[PDB]
Design a protein around this ligand. Structure first.
Ligand SMILES: CC(=O)N[C@@H]1[C@@H](O)[C@H](O[C@@H]2O[C@H](CO)[C@H](O)[C@H](O[C@]3(C(=O)O)C[C@H](O)[C@@H](NC(C)=O)[C@H]([C@H](O)[C@H](O)CO)O3)[C@H]2O)[C@@H](CO)O[C@H]1O
Lengths: 39, 237, 247, 287, 247, 39, 247, 39
């Protein structure tokens, strides 16, 4: 980026961080694999 | 030493006392699908001996005016034995093939057959813009016949067909041809009923001839699938 | 100066290009970032959330009635209850789902799908169903004896209200694709069918017709490629008020 | 067996041979192997340090050329009373329409490559000057939704890639990556791309890059013009597998390998090579 | 900014140029590579495979009959059987071969060629032939006494069915070239002729007319330069269906 | 290559590896020079 | 991207520019170099070779007669035999020589010249001549007493057949130049004259008229600058066959 | 030179090697300064 303002830069396509659980498993108590979910 | 050979797979074996070494297509050998190339995630079935064995198809007669014969794989075997059953019950299949073409005659007979394994042999139709139909392509165990072997029925040429894995059966020299074929495709597995990886072509470049007692001279094809794997189990089609 | 020459492509405007460009407001200081709940960084995170399949997409079924499949106490055995076409790239029960909508912004896909069904009958209602996934090749099975030969899960109604049928990625090619031909060898996924394993059985005071709600989602072995405009939205005229933005 | 070759092999001097049991000039074509007789074994040779390079025959270079794959001319005008490409057209991408490129690609069974696309535009008045029009080329995936009018809202191209260019600018250019759903494109496909039996033979949709929709962005002018758009494709980062017999019969269709042959040799169905009087007749014999 | 100036050539589109260009689909992830049998990296690999020469390119010979040369039991001695023109850059028996077809995509060539002949008569048939390569300069030899003075191999029919005649690279210049003049000093390769060394001899029950199949290939000392469009393919009209790609 | 996607790069004309034998000698048993091919 | 701006000169095509340009044939492998006799790297090497001056450029002298100066036995003393104009940049005896021809592709020159004369009379012929170089300023000397005051060499005929008169670089300015004005102070080199020092003397049976061949060349202290089109070649029409190159 | 083929490069004006004697004195026996050339 030859411009003085950083917002002028090209795209930033390097953020590979993810956390699907905030959408797929937003339950307070984690669900164990194989174990009956309701006990 | 390189003229005699025994091939043994499953409960089947074949010997020849007049071979000409044998061909390993592109210098490769069949193998099972490795984990780093796999796509389908279900555990595959590897029947081994029930499918990896020699299947002998009906013979054809070599006549003075023959144009040549062809058999597409796996189509030719899709309805034979346990290989055929696995193919019908599974959406996906994968395998190599051991091909052995047989033709014997007499020290007084002459003739030369080009035995070539063609990958993706997409046929063309003659003198029409209409593409070949399903029945023009899928002949099954009976195989088909060449209309214009001179251009390999695809507008190219048999003269340059030697660029493909092949051997010859020149009657004064040998009585059999053997070609080992590895899985050949752009995908690790495929649906066996709509795509043929290889086409076995047997074409008489030098016609059968003799001045001795005339006899029926057959050409026989035996094919053994190798390292068979099947995925996507369901009901039979 | 520096000797240079312009290459083909010079001066063009490619909508997918990636370059820096002149800042309109120099020395502008953007508002400080603040933590906000629910940040999403990859669309694959969104499609892993299961959403309702519109299985009852039939004439006579209106609105939410289309989002549930009613099953009744049967008089005959091994009865077929319903089936579901599987091309998440074509219109059908799977199109208006999170995985379906986002996938339709792409052309190629790969990965396992998961269908979860929740039984919504009364507590006193019992039953066993069999959910089957049939890889492609033939006609959709119409009898349990045939469907049962494919991938399946036998579901017993009970305290745990839902069952999951995994539709494992079973394809010859790395990816499947959309090309508007549902019968193409690179598109057809196969079928999902549901039959009574036993029967829905309920007492006199429980409703004898119960509903199931089917959900679908992608697993984390999913991948989407080749972005394209979605076929699910379009316009033939200016929206109301659009022209007023110029007045 | 695999090795790095940068120049043609050298020749080593050879002496007289008279050894029993050694017959390098004899071979057995039946094995399928090509003769391994070396020049040194057939005749007496001298030593030659061969410096001839082999880079021009590298597959990357052999196929690495921008070849014409599409040429389309249409009328740019007020199409009020047109039955016809009304200021735009759609082209299902394929590499089977122009024979020079087609024959070369068909020398291989499978090919993996990225494709550099170059678009050249030309205009002619149907005289008072040539307008510097702006064109839009939108990439629409195979079988996907294409525009039906020059001013369709489909051209808003929210996700599809679009390139806008002027006739006065150098030809537009961009690279389409190797986008096949498989590890390589199938130049030939011995199968049917559908689960039923009525599908098309030899056409694997997985090998169709997609649709190219091109329109003139400018509204029509008071007069009509003929606009021609030429698209060139250059494969790069190439990997090739299983070479094949070269095409000899003229092509008949872009959808198949159907053949008929020329009316008379050369390249006629019953005679690829032109005839000579006899097998002992030497053409172009030095008199 | 940086002071610059455009050079002649700026803005042109050279079909053989080599530059990077804008990616149409950013962040696209190509399908993983998979090992596939038969990879070819240099076209020279292809021309080293021998293919059939169309030696019997005569009127009356149809299709595959053109790919074999028939020899019969002779009544006279030292008989000439056939000859073969050698310009792999012009139409003739060598044009539709792997080496011929690929070489015709180029203009310059250098290297040794090899011709292999396979005798396809019966086992009981015997014979000796002499295959001769005559470097350029004069008229094609018509008698064995003359042909025999050039490069040659005397072939004895037997268990090993094939013989190889090497056509060594013998040229004044590093490369030979095509210029459509077969008699040019930079094009003419010379001649190949075949005579009976003794005679084809067979018993009563063997066919008394036998065929030979001739093959040709380049050796690994071969080199090709200056790519050009091949003269072996052309079109004067749109192919069927080409225009339909626009509908 | 100033583009972010590697497939955008210029041509790669540096692969001089070769193995003609996969086409010229795909026989299981290597053929020795001078020795009769059929024995 | 990089901010830039085009400078005056941008887009122009200067025939003497020096830049790299797009290779038409990528990966082309030029023919290997081979040692060849007579390589020349600087044109100054060529002009150091002496070549024949056309001193007898007179009407009546045809062809090679113009390349030799005939001298006869004189009846009078101190006789003037011939003179030579010295502007190697104008038409005259020095123009069609190696140094003259190459120098005329330039505008400025500096360095010493050397004139060598070979006596071609019979062995029995004797004589002494005086060759004089007169720096510029006045009229060409017509008497030996005047010429003798300049740079000179007295030549005695004998076994060594040739004599060399050095025309040393004597100039006020570093270089002399051509401007089509032979009398310009920056062009005129002066004069060369030849007189009998004694006389040509021969016996009755020897020819009494003998020839001299004069040669000229530059020494290695020579320098040429400012290239220009040569005035020694030109065309007003297409050469025969030029237009046929388009047919 | 940013092109991949070396023949595309700009001119090479740095070869100052010379050997005029191959043209000016191609005689087998070198001629000594001052000494009679013919002896
Ligand atoms: C008259 C005579 O003595 N003998 C002819 C013999 O010349 C003729 O041969 C044809 O001759 C022409 C020259 O006129 C060409 O050399 C033909 O060859 C090719 C070529 O190399 O150019 C081969 C190529 O494959 C062909 N291409 C296509 C795309 O079809 C071209 C093409 O037809 C021509 O360029 C036409 O424009 O020709 C060569 O065969 C034979 C014919 O039987 O007949 C003798 O009598």
């Amino acid at each position: 980026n030859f411009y003085k303002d950083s917002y002028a830069a090209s795209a930033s396509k390097q953020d590979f961080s993810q956390d699907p659980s905030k959408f797929t498993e937003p339950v307070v108590e984690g669900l164990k694999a194989g174990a009956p979910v309701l006990k | 030493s390189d003229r005699v050979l025994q091939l043994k797979l499953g409960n089947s074996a074949i010997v020849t006392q007049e071979a000409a070494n044998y061909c390993c297509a592109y210098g490769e050998w069949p193998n099972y699908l490795p984990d780093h190339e796999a796509v389908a995630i279900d555990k595959p079935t590897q029947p081994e001996t029930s499918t990896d064995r020699f299947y002998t198809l009906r013979s054809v007669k070599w006549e003075s005016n023959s144009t040549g014969w062809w058999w597409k794989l796996p189509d030719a075997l899709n309805n034979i034995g346990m290989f055929g059953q696995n193919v019908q019950y599974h959406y996906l299949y994968r395998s190599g093939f051991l091909i052995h073409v047989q033709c014997n005659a007499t020290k007084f007979h002459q003739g030369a057959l080009l035995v070539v394994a063609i990958p993706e042999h997409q046929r063309g139709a003659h003198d029409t813009t209409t593409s070949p139909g399903f029945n023009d392509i899928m002949k099954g165990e009976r195989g088909g016949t060449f209309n214009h072997p001179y251009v390999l029925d695809d507008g190219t040429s048999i003269a340059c067909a030697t660029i493909f894995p092949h051997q010859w059966i020149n009657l004064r020299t040998n009585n059999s041809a053997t070609i080992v074929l590895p899985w050949m495709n752009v995908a690790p597995m495929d649906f066996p009923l709509r795509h043929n990886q290889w086409t076995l072509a047997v074409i008489p470049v030098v016609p059968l001839g003799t001045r001795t007692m005339s006899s029926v001279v057959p050409i026989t094809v035996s094919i053994a699938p190798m390292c068979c794997e099947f995925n996507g189990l369901r009901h039979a089609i | 100066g520096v000797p240079t020459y312009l290459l083909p492509g010079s001066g063009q405007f490619l909508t997918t290009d990636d370059h820096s460009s002149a800042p309109v407001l120099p020395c502008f200081n953007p508002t400080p970032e603040m933590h906000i709940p629910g940040q999403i960084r990859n669309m694959l995170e969104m499609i892993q959330v299961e959403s309702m399949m519109e299985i009852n997409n039939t004439d006579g079924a209106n609105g939410m009635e289309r989002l549930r499949v009613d099953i009744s106490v049967q008089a005959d055995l091994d009865q077929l209850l319903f089936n579901i076409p599987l091309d998440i790239q074509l219109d059908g029960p799977l199109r208006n789902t999170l995985v379906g909508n986002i996938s339709r912004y792409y052309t190629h896909w790969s990965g396992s799908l998961e269908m979860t069904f929740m039984f919504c009958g009364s507590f006193m209602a019992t039953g066993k169903l069999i959910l089957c996934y049939t890889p492609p090749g033939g006609s959709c099975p119409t009898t349990r004896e045939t469907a049962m030969l494919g991938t399946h899960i036998v579901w017993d109604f009970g305290l745990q209200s839902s069952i999951t049928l995994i539709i494992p990625w079973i394809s010859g090619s790395h990816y499947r694709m959309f090309n508007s031909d549902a019968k193409s060898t690179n598109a057809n996924v196969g079928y999902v069918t549901c039959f009574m394993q036993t029967n829905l059985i309920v007492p006199s005071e429980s409703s004898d017709t119960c509903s199931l709600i089917g959900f679908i989602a992608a697993k984390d072995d999913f991948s989407l490629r080749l972005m394209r405009d979605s076929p699910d939205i379009g316009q033939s005229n200016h929206l109301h008020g659009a022209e007023a933005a110029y007045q | 067996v695999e090795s790095i070759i940068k120049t043609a092999t050298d020749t080593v001097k050879s002496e007289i041979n008279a050894e029993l049991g050694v017959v390098p000039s004899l071979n057995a074509v039946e094995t399928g192997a090509t003769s391994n007789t070396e020049p040194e074994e057939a005749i007496q040779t001298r030593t030659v340090i061969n410096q001839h390079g082999v880079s021009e025959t590298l597959v990357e270079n052999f196929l690495g050329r921008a070849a014409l794959v599409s040429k389309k001319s249409f009328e740019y005008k007020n199409h009020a009373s047109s039955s016809t490409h009304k200021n735009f057209f759609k082209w299902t991408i394929n590499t089977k329409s122009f024979v020079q490129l087609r024959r070369k690609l068909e020398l291989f069974t499978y090919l993996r490559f990225d494709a550099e696309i170059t678009i050249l535009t030309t205009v002619a008045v149907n005289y008072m000057g040539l307008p510097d029009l702006t064109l839009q080329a939108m990439f629409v995936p195979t079988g996907a939704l294409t525009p039906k009018e020059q001013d369709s809202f489909h051209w808003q191209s929210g996700s599809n890639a679009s390139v806008f260019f002027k006739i006065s600018d150098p030809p537009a250019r961009m690279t389409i990556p190797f986008m096949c759903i498989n590890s390589a494109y199938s130049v030939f496909y011995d199968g049917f791309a559908g689960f039923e039996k009525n599908g098309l033979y030899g056409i694997n949709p997985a090998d169709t890059i997609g649709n190219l929709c091109v329109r003139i962005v400018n509204e029509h002018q008071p007069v009509g013009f003929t606009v021609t758009v030429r698209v060139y494709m250059k494969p790069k980062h190439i990997k090739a597998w299983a070479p094949r017999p070269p095409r000899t019969m003229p092509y008949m269709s872009i959808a198949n390998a159907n053949y008929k042959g020329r009316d008379t040799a050369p390249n006629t169905l019953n005679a690829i090579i032109g005839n000579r009087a006899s097998v002992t007749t030497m053409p172009h014999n030095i008199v």
